[PDB]
Amino acid sequence: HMRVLFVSSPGIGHLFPLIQLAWGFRTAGHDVLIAVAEHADRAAAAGLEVVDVAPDYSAVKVFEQVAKDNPRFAETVATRPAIDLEEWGVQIAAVNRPLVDGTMALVDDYRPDLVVYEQGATVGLLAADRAGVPAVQRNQSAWRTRGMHRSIASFLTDLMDKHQVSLPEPVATIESFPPSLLLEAEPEGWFMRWVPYGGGAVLGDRLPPVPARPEVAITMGTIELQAFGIGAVEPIIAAAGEVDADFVLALGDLDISPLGTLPRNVRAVGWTPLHTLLRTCTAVVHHGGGGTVMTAIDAGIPQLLAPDPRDQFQHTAREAVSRRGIGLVSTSDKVDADLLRRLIGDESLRTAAREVREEMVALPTPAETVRRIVERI
Amino acid sequence: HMRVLFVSSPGIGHLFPLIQLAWGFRTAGHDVLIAVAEHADRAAAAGLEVVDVAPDYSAVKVFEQVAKDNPRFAETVATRPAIDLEEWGVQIAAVNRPLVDGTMALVDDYRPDLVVYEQGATVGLLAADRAGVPAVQRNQSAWRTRGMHRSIASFLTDLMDKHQVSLPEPVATIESFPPSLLLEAEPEGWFMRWVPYGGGAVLGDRLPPVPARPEVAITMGTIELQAFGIGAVEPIIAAAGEVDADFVLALGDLDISPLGTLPRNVRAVGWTPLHTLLRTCTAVVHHGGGGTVMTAIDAGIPQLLAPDPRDQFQHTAREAVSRRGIGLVSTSDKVDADLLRRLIGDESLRTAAREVREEMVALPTPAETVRRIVERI
């Protein structure tokens, strides 16, 4: 019987792919606690206990750290898209820094027997050293770890001296993507079936009705929405109204009006978990998160990755999708009618999506992975 | 791979002990949906998808329906404590009635492969018949099922004709209480380790501090409080005032001002999940729900059951706690200093509580139970 600690640093997509593992551990009878520094209420709403290890976290202070430690990062590495996380070390370090004091304090109080952390959260690894216990890493997308944690730690040495901690290696790394979506393996890389989680939902007095014609979903994460705004979507909706398919627009629960008068074959829909919405869908157009890519795979439908041109974090997803052939890649500004027509019509996309789905289902479930983890330690 | 439907009828204690099973199924890769008729938001806050199968549910329309089907009930059976759930058939039927149309509709749309329902939710069993699939029952306390479902169904004949359904037997019944707390077995009764669930929480910037002195938890549930009122607890606190020990008063989210000044050895505390609170407690005084009894066992501490004298559903819990010796029984009006002193000092209570805890922990976890259920079907 164990006390297990889940560590998630701030950033899009970081939290949710930990939930199934946290529940897996709880339903196996272990004590489970999550440490986060944003969206603590979101972790609670998955029925979990959460400690906010940095109530004073500030994206502005994160950038001041970077300006201090690498004055030229902003006008160099940051202007082009991430292809390797280690080169973003100075910044990931800046993100991890404000979490350190509180995480160390938490590890002292809670005395975890194990630490599970998301990839971008080196603090997870230092937490595991402070406790002297095994750490298990959780990957959200196609990003290879390589030397990122050493790079990151190099920018946190004052903090590592203060807490007398050193940098260990995780005993296992759990991928989100199936083998054929990855070209290079992680050290001690473990594969795990993706089980979509998007938050709980009161769906209504019934299940969402099955639509007259099976629809194409155009969806945008409420956090990806804040940054780029509604500007991105117009050119996609405009494209859609020139296509032989019915489209459904899932922009969360945002005011749909300032877009304008929606094309007759595009209908807006209130928020539901993505996986709920896709059971009635034939394809999906989205921003390009690894979570979504996988949730689309779970639906066995083809997809189109169309992030805004200014998203610096969409590369690794794109290559995976292109190379394996489960979908199409473009940018939000570049989407046209012909591309959407190809999404619905190019059968080789569906064949692949279905083939990968079959590949992913054969992989260990969260429940089985918990079991494998316990045995390994 | 299966679609699994969870059915919970209105009533204190009905929903929560389904959560661990729902999570267990989801983490094993299955589709999971909860059907409720009250507190749909609570089920969502455990990260699940919920359908409200009776948006117009009314405790008042319920009371009227029994006042029609059995006018003598309201002043006979309802005035003395349930010793037998079957005797309450007319009312349990009334409670299930408004859920039938919606649940039948849901089963047609969702096509579940398996139904899991809490004990007082006969509709679960009719839903399983509609689908032609196995049902598994979940018990929350010591109540024996015996002939309750047949008695309940006998009041729902018009609705069974309408939906062309018959009443099946569950293929298994999952107990909340461990063997030595039970005198009589369910047919195909299975035992399962209790893993406390009270809802997620943002605990703060740290874990609740370990207190100066070890404390006796005086607790009462938020919904339990809406029924009985906050005055039902003055006496217990007054008593505590006169005991050379320390108490922590935990009354959910409730405004606590109506109790006025508290004795210097009783301290109020904001809401956390029960299991979190009891980590540092040495004993617990509570209203007597089966969930709470089991959460106290999981803490391995002795307990005192002090329900309001007007709680008609207290009996089965009482006998289990008395007979096994894991705690003391009284009513809220009757609690005195000497009884509290006994709670803290009678070592035989701790020995038994610890003994039962060891018995419970050796039972199958919810993860292992899911696995047993799938094998059985």
Side-chain angles (χ1 to χ4, degrees), chain B residues 9 45 48 61 85 89 98 108 121 139 172 205 212 226 286 297 319 372:
Chain B
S9 72
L48 302 174
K61 295 227 153 168
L85 287 179
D108 294 330
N139 284 347
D205 61 320
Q226 303 318 300
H286 60 97
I297 287 296
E319 179 70 292
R372 289 192 188 286

Side-chain angles (χ1 to χ4, degrees), chain A residues 221-246:
Chain A
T222 62
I223 351 153
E224 308 169 324
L225 248 158
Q226 290 181 40
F228 296 116
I230 33 78
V233 220
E234 270 182 284
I236 282 160
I237 294 165
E242 202 61 342
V243 181
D244 188 5
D246 291 19

Side-chain angles (χ1 to χ4, degrees), chain A residues 72-82 88 312:
Chain A
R72 292 197 78 240
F73 187 88
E75 78 154 321
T76 59
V77 179
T79 61
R80 83 190 139 257
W88 279 79
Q312 295 324 311

Side-chain angles (χ1 to χ4, degrees), chain A residues 26 45 49-50 52 201 203-204 276, chain B residues 45 49-50 52 196 201 203-204 275-276:
Chain A
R26 183 64 172 160
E49 286 144 271
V50 211
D52 181 1
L203 297 175
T276 293
Chain B
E49 287 138 280
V50 208
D52 191 345
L203 304 177
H275 67 257
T276 291

Side-chain angles (χ1 to χ4, degrees), chain A residues 138-149:
Chain A
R138 174 44 166 173
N139 282 354
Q140 47 140 259
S141 199
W143 308 111
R144 307 296 64 184
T145 296
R146 299 189 174 101
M148 62 182 276
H149 294 301

Side-chain angles (χ1 to χ4, degrees), chain A residues 299-316:
Chain A
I301 63 172
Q303 71 198 289
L304 164 61
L305 276 84
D308 189 81
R310 292 134 16 140
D311 195 325
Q312 295 324 311
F313 280 99
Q314 301 307 340
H315 176 87
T316 52

